[PDB]
Design a protein around this ligand. Sequence first.
Ligand code: JC5
Length: 190
Amino acid sequence: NIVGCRIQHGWKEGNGPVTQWKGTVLDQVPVNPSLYLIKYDGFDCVYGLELNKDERVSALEVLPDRVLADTMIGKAVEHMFETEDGSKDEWRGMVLARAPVMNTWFYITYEKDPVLYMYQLLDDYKEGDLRIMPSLVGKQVEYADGSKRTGMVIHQVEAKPSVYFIKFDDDFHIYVYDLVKTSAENLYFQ
Ligand SMILES: COc1c(CN)cc(CN)cc1OCCCN1Cc2ccccc2C1
């Protein structure tokens, strides 16, 4: 496969209401083929779900088929955006890679929220909203006073090889870490 397909499904946590979601399947993770990375319409993060076993997913359907600036990859950037009150704000981050499947899009993450995001950064650049600044994959990871969180390293960023993507068992975001930085100092690997 469903990589490259558009999908829709219901979502239900506990006894809560069922919500309906539409998205695009970007990736079947090689080190965990149960794990799919998904871009949901209108939501900017990249999500990871083990679709074959996550009981929160219901009524999974495949939707009918729909669908250089590589110099930006690896760059530190300031990404400007419009706020709920009209004022402009910005987050600084790093362009990680071109997104798969949705190839005009780019993977990016930010110091203020170091999870995996996906944006049409060449459009934002043309609009004046992007300022360009001048073997662990497959291993288990844990971080832990008393917070004991488990996951897996799922990808290494080719353009900055100390940077990795991690999928934690307790959440559907994709977490991005530079293993030389303070943000990663409580991550341990096996
Ligand atoms: C506002 O999001 C953007 C949108 C809207 N879909 C669109 C675009 C593309 N023009 C950029 C955005 O922001 C680029 C920085 C990263 N965002 C800043 C932020 C603030 C609060 C909550 C989450 C985020 C993520």
